[PDB]
Design an enzyme around this catalytic site. Structure first.
Site, PDB file in Angstrom:
ATOM      1  N   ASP A 111      -8.901   5.754  27.130  1.00  0.00           N
ATOM      2  CA  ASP A 111      -9.521   6.510  26.025  1.00  0.00           C
ATOM      3  C   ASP A 111     -10.954   6.493  26.625  1.00  0.00           C
ATOM      4  O   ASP A 111     -11.898   5.608  26.378  1.00  0.00           O
ATOM      5  CB  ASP A 111      -9.503   5.940  24.786  1.00  0.00           C
ATOM      6  CG  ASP A 111     -10.390   6.863  23.785  1.00  0.00           C
ATOM      7  OD1 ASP A 111     -10.666   7.937  24.202  1.00  0.00           O
ATOM      8  OD2 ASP A 111     -10.569   6.485  22.601  1.00  0.00           O
ATOM      9  N   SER A 135     -19.537  22.702  30.565  1.00  0.00           N
ATOM     10  CA  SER A 135     -18.983  23.798  31.184  1.00  0.00           C
ATOM     11  C   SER A 135     -19.818  24.969  31.404  1.00  0.00           C
ATOM     12  O   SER A 135     -20.598  25.382  30.603  1.00  0.00           O
ATOM     13  CB  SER A 135     -17.627  23.912  30.563  1.00  0.00           C
ATOM     14  OG  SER A 135     -16.822  24.798  31.071  1.00  0.00           O
TER      15      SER A 135
END
Length: 330
Positions: A35, A199
Site C-alpha cells: 500500500d 498530473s
C-alpha cells in the site's frame, strides 16, 4: 541488494493485490496488500481477537526465534475507506522477494474492523508511503522500504500491476524489459506523507487532451481512480445511461456498455487506461448495473491515482533524497 516478488489480484475484479512476505524464523509467509498510501506493516496474528479472524493466515511471534516485543509500542490506523485496525508491535526479520530487512517493525493486530475480517485473502498490509505517516506510538517506526533503502542497489521500488493478471513489485532496480518507451519522471511532494504528484491533464476516449493540473497520490492500496467531479462527469457523459447513484455510492453504468479509455498526463507523456480497466462489474450479483472504476474525489479531500490508473503503467517510486515518481507505458 534487490528483491522481486509477484503480486496477484485477490479476485476477478482486481479489487486488490497480494504479495507473499516472509516474516520471522523459520519464515511465516503471509500475503500482504502492498500500500503506497500508508506506512504501517501490520498483520493478522495469534493476538487477533478470534472472532475477527476468518480464514486469514496469522503471524505467531512466539514461534519466531527472531521476534522481539517492542516494549510499550502500540499502533492504531484508520484508512480512507473507513476500515481500521490496532495492536502491539514486534520487531522481526522480514523478506520480500529475496530482500531481507532485520529488525523490521511488524505491527500485530489485536483488533481489525469488519472489512478486514470479511476478506480472507489479505493477511495484512505492507505500507510503502513515507515513514512520517507510521502510527506506532510512542516511537514511530520505519517502513520496510525505508529500512531496506540504504542496502538497495538503487533507492527505488517499482509497481507493475496486472490487469486481471499477476504483476511484480521490484526493490532496488528498474527492469528495463518491463515497459515500453521511456519513463517520464515527475516531482513529488512528501508534505502529507504520500507519493503526491501533479498530473498535467486528461482525455476521454479519442477526445482532445485537456491541459489542467490535477494534484493526487499514487496509491496501490486504493482500487479505483478518484478525480475531481468535473473530470469524472466528463468521462461518464461519454457512456450512454451512466449516472451517479447516491444509493449505490458513485457512478454506475449499463453492463451492456463499451467503456471509453481514459488518458492521464505525466509531464508531456500520456498514460492510457483502456476502457475495460474501468469496469468493476455488477453492483450486486445478477444486476445489469455495473460499478464504474473512475469516481469523484469530492468527498475525499485528495485525488487518488489508485490501481485503475497505476495498472496501466510501470511506476517507479524513486526514494532518493528528493523523491520523484516515474511512469512508463507497458
Amino acid at each position: 541488494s534487490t528483491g522481486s516478488a509477484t503480486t496477484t489480484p485477490i479476485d476477478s475484479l482486481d479489487d486488490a493485490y497480494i504479495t507473499p512476505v516472509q516474516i520471522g524464523t523459520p519464515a511465516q509467509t503471509l500475503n500482504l496488500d502492498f500500500d503506497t498510501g500508508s506506512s504501517d506493516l501490520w498483520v493478522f496474528s495469534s493476538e487477533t481477537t478470534a472472532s475477527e479472524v476468518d480464514g486469514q493466515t496469522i503471524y505467531t511471534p512466539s514461534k519466531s526465534t527472531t521476534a522481539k516485543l517492542l516494549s510499550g509500542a502500540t499502533w492504531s490506523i484508520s484508512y480512507g475507506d473507513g476500515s481500521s485496525s490496532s495492536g502491539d508491535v514486534y520487531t522481526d526479520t522480514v523478506s520480500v522477494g529475496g530482500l531481507t530487512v532485520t529488525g523490521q517493525a511488524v505491527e500485530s493486530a489485536k483488533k481489525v474492523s469488519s472489512s478486514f475480517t470479511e476478506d480472507s485473502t489479505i493477511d495484512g498490509l505492507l505500507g510503502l508511503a513515507f515513514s512520517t505517516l507510521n502510527t506506532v506510538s510512542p516511537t514511530q517506526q520505519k517502513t520496510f522500504f525505508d529500512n531496506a533503502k540504504a542496502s538497495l542497489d538503487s533507492p527505488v521500488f517499482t509497481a507493475d500491476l496486472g490487469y486481471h493478471a499477476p504483476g511484480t513489485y521490484n526493490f532496488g532496480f528498474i527492469d528495463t524489459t518491463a515497459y515500453t518507451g521511456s519513463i517520464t519522471y515527475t516531482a513529488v511532494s512528501t508534505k502529507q506523507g504520500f507519493w503526491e504528484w501533479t498530473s498535467t491533464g486528461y482525455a476521454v476516449g479519442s477526445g482532445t487532451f485537456k491541459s489542467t493540473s490535477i494534484d493526487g497520490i499514487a496509491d496501490t492500496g486504493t482500487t479505483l481512480l478518484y478525480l475531481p467531479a468535473t473530470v469524472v462527469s466528463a468521462y461518464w457523459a461519454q457512456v450512454s445511461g451512466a449516472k451517479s447513484s447516491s444509493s449505490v455510492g458513485g457512478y454506475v453504468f449499463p453492463c451492456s456498455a463499451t467503456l471509453p479509455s481514459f488518458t492521464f498526463g505525466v509531464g508531456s507523456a500520456r498514460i492510457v487506461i483502456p476502457g475495460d480497466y474501468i469496469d468493476f462489474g455488477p453492483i450486486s450479483t445478477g444486476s445489469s448495473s455495473c460499478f464504474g472504476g473512475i469516481q469523484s474525489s469530492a468527498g475525499i479531500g485528495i485525488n487518488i491515482f489508485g490501481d485503475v490508473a497505476l495498472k496501466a503503467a510501470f511506476v517507479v517510486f524513486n526514494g532518493a533524497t528528493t523523491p520523484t515518481l516515474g511512469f512508463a507505458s507497458k
